[PDB]
Write a protein that binds this ligand. Structure first.
Ligand SMILES: [Mg+2]
Ligand SMILES: [Mg+2]
Ligand SMILES: [Mg+2]
Ligand SMILES: [Mg+2]
Ligand SMILES: [Zn+2]
Lengths: 111, 261, 115, 37, 217, 69
RNA sequence: ACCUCGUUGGAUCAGGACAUCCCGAUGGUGCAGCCGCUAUUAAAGGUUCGUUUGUUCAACGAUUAAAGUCCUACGUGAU
């Protein structure tokens, strides 16, 4: 199966410079897992996103529809939306300027 | 005879009941049109030589009508056939494998869900229509000096030819002509009332007779393997069909509410 | 449906959106073959005498059933690459944005509420 | 092919052939030499 | 006895068999999803499964501002404001992906259509998302909320003051001058309530539909 | 200034306690983020923002609006 | 052999040519793939919306797969 365990294992194997996971409650109608990972550069981001997408494609769930890779043209932020989990690859400056952590943990308690 | 590749079977003549929504398991809504098979019978059979072509033909009728309102020759034809007269008679091109004896009834279960079908009928007659409604011409602006020309055709030709080309789009009678909708999916079949639920729209008005036949599109060339080849015979009684035959993707009413888990 | 010349409401945390100006933001181009923008379509905006891309996240025109109809034509500023200009979206964002073809995960991540 | 009013062989392997009604210069070694009347 | 609006057909030349088939499907779906009695003006919470997510439900609470459509495609559009943003959703009653319909507050309004709440003040469309369901006595006529809303300045979605709309739930005296009301009266059409051939008598049709429903039970 | 002097400290302790069993994310990054959140702001606020800050910290601790796993 | 100066668009609907702007098929390339450039063939189909200007045009803005060159008595004003 392709799950969050496989996701974190693959990300650690490709050595993401920073990994975080958010457990999205079911009452929020988006997803189950919100993964946010930082990287060294746009090349590293592209490589790791491509690698995880290839692993998803090859692993299992033939009935599960294929998955886009968003943010290819931009360099500082890519994102991939799976059936039950969404990964946001970015650079440290992008992460600190968008503060997705505070957004997705404190829904209405930030600025 | 059993079904062979390249065999074309007869179709039906149904009555357009109306439209209703339908939902597929993916969560999408499809509008569907109900076609009721009302007293549809095979009336006539002709061979390839006299079919005005090179394929056997079955004349099929439906929607029994009053004998008091028909011409004497038609009444004689139906008397020899042993049936009450039908409102419309349509000719279906078939191979000799699919020949059916005249007088045999035809039922909605002649089709099956998941099959693709072609429906031909006279479109709604809109009478003499102007060119804006008939051909979607732009017309002229409403103001800025425009006088007495808002919905008129502009130039109808060039000055050189000194004439108007045949087939030029002009005001005239719109609708009330035969049109065919191709490749419509049969979503469901109510065998009790002989209803076919056909995907999308069908030409013509409600309570109008439409001719329904297996789709001629290349993608659906050889999908007749599992269909009742000559036709469906309820008298065969091999397996009494359920009241409703559904396509696999159809969200049947009475099923537990679909959850995209 | 958002066309050219439609005035639009920038629902975004961005300085361009939240900065007062004499002219309200006005759609300059709809990045669609028919010049009609629905939810998920990109448009080009004239904000503060500046041309900025933006994404439609709501409009008054009715859509398909089960989808929300908003009282205003809500738009989110995005860069040419695709990164949202702002960092927070306050008003609810339709969930139908997820499965539409096109990159919307960034906007969904930025969004606070969904309808 | 290059369309030429007059066909000229360029190297040794350039050969004139009348095909499909018109003259051509073909060449195995130098396809750059391909000419059509 | 409350017959849900979608069951009564709009008049036409359509065959009654089509309505019988459609009602069979509607009742057979109602056996699975309980469609409660509600009216335009009652507050509803609708829970529906999202195909965009994976087996996750979405809840929307709002005032039913319109009931429309007949048969299996019947819809009700209900309205709310979320963080100051007015939103309306048109829910299909017999869509298989509506998990639940809850009548948080069963009430009737002075009008059979509250589309003018778009032009009313936002307070008249604001409703708490987590408001608790009120309770009505089992044997009790449905309450009629005679609230007359206050309107925002005159540019409106529709000319609500025109008599063809027949709006009773708006305080026209507050927002419109007597001259404006008199001008609106030019569209009165007083004969239209008296032309007897325009009225649609659905007594027999409702009786037959009730027999069908009782047989389905 | 805050709701109580010890409330912030107890909340920080509980944050570290629930980070003790952190499984999927980066523990070092989690601790660094908590340190940032509680050091770049909680030095010289006004008496009014303290209540909001501690309320948001308590909500994050509860994790009913999304928890770090 | 000094100077000067001697019906037109638009809208509407378009018919046609190919000397092709895009879509199709090929040859070569001072193109490794991506591409560009060039040539042959291809007219079934398509060929945007705006600001200033009356503009015939032109420039500019934003797009587009492309925003082709023409003939048709401005093609067409008893529309
Ligand atoms: Mg017009
Ligand atoms: Mg006029
Ligand atoms: Mg309006
Ligand atoms: Mg040529
Ligand atoms: Zn040579």
């Amino acid at each position: 199966k392709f799950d969050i365990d496989m996701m974190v294992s693959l990300l650690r194997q490709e050595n993401a410079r920073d990994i975080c996971v958010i457990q999205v409650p079911p009452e929020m109608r988006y997803t189950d897992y919100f993964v946010i990972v930082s990287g060294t550069s746009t090349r590293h981001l592209h490589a790791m996103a491509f690698y995880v997408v290839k692993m998803y494609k090859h692993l299992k769930c033939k009935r599960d529809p294929h998955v886009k890779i968003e943010g290819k043209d931009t360099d500082d932020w890519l994102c991939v939306d799976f059936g039950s989990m969404v990964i946001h690859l970015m650079l440290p400056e992008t992460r600190e300027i968008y503060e997705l952590e505070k957004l997705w943990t404190l829904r209405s308690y930030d600025d | 005879h059993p079904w062979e590749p390249g065999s074309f079977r007869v179709g039906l003549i149904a009555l357009k009941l109306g439209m209703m929504p339908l939902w597929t398991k993916d969560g999408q809504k499809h509008v569907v049109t109900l076609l009721q098979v009302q007293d549809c019978h095979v009336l006539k059979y002709t061979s390839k030589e006299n079919c005005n072509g090179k394929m056997a033909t079955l004349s099929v009728g439906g929607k029994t009508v009053s004998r008091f309102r028909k011409a004497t020759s038609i009444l004689e034809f139906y008397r020899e056939l042993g049936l009450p007269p039908k409102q419309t008679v349509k000719i279906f091109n078939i191979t000799d494998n699919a020949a059916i004896k005249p007088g045999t009834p035809l039922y909605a279960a002649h089709f099956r869900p998941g099959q693709y079908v072609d429906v031909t009928a006279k479109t709604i007659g809109k009478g003499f229509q102007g060119v804006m409604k008939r051909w979607g011409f732009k017309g002229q602006p409403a103001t800025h000096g425009q006088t007495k020309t808002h919905r008129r055709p502009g130039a109808v030709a060039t000055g050189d030819i000194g004439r108007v080309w045949p087939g030029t789009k002009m005001p005239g009678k719109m609708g009330n002509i035969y049109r065919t909708e191709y490749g419509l999916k049969v979503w469901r079949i109510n065998t009790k009332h002989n209803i076919i639920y056909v995907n999308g729209s069908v030409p013509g008005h409600k309570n109008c007779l439409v001719k329904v036949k297996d789709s001629k599109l290349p993608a659906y060339k050889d999908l007749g393997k599992n269909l009742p080849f000559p036709t469906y015979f309820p008298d065969g009684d091999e397996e009494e069909l359920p009241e409703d035959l559904y396509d696999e993707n159809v969200c049947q009413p009475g099923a537990p509410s679909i959850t995209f888990a | 449906a958002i066309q050219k010349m439609t005035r639009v409401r920038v629902v975004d945390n961005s300085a361009l959106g939240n900065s007062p100006y004499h002219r309200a933001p006005r759609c300059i181009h709809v990045y669609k073959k028919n010049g009609v923008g629905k939810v998920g379509d990109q448009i080009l905006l004239a904000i503060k005498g500046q041309k900025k891309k933006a994404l439609i996240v709501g409009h008054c025109m009715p859509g398909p059933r089960m989808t929300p109809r908003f009282d205003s034509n809500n738009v989110v500023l995005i860069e040419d690459n695709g990164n949202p200009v702002g960092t927070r979206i306050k008003t609810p964002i339709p969930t139908s944005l997820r499965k539409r073809e096109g990159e919307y995960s960034k906007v969904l991540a930025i969004a606070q509420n969904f309808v | 092919f290059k369309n030429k009013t007059v066909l000229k062989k360029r190297c040794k392997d350039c050969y004139l052939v009348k095909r499909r009604g018109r003259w051509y210069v073909y060449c195995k070694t130098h396809p750059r030499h391909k000419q059509r009347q | 006895r409350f017959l849900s609006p979608e069951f009564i057909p709009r008049r036409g030349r359509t065959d009654p068999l089509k309505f019988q088939i459609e009602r069979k499907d509607m009742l057979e779906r109602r056996k699975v999803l309980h469609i409660p009695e509600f009216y335009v003006g009652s507050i509803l919470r609708v829970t529906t499964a999202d195909p965009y997510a994976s087996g996750k439900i979405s809840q929307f609470l709002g005032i039913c501002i319109q009931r429309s459509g007949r048969g299996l495609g019947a819809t009700f559009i209900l309205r709310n404001v979320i963080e100051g943003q007015g939103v309306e959703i048109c829910f299909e009653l017999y869509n298989p992906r509506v998990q639940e319909i809850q009548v948080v507050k069963l009430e009737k309004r002075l009008d059979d259509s509250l589309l003018y709440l778009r032009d009313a003040l936002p307070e008249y469309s604001t409703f708490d998302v987590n408001m608790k369901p009120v309770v009505q006595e089992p044997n009790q006529k449905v309450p009629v909320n005679e609230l007359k809303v206050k309107m925002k300045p005159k540019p409106w979605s529709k000319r609500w003051e025109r008599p063809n709309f027949n709006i009773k739930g708006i305080r026209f005296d507050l927002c419109l001058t007597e001259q404006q009301m008199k001008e609106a009266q030019k569209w009165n059409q007083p004969w239209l309530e008296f032309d007897m051939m325009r009225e649609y008598d659905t007594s027999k049709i409702e009786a037959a539909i009730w027999k069908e429903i009782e047989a389905s039970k | 200034a805050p709701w109580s002097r010890e409330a912030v400290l107890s909340l920080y302790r509980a944050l570290l306690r629930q980070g003790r069993q952190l499984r999927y994310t980066d523990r070092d990054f989690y601790f660094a983020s908590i340190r940032r959140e509680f050091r770049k702001n909680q030095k010289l606020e006004d008496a009014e923002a303290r209540e909001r800050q501690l309320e948001k910290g308590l909500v994050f601790l509860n994790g009913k609006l999304g928890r770090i796993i």
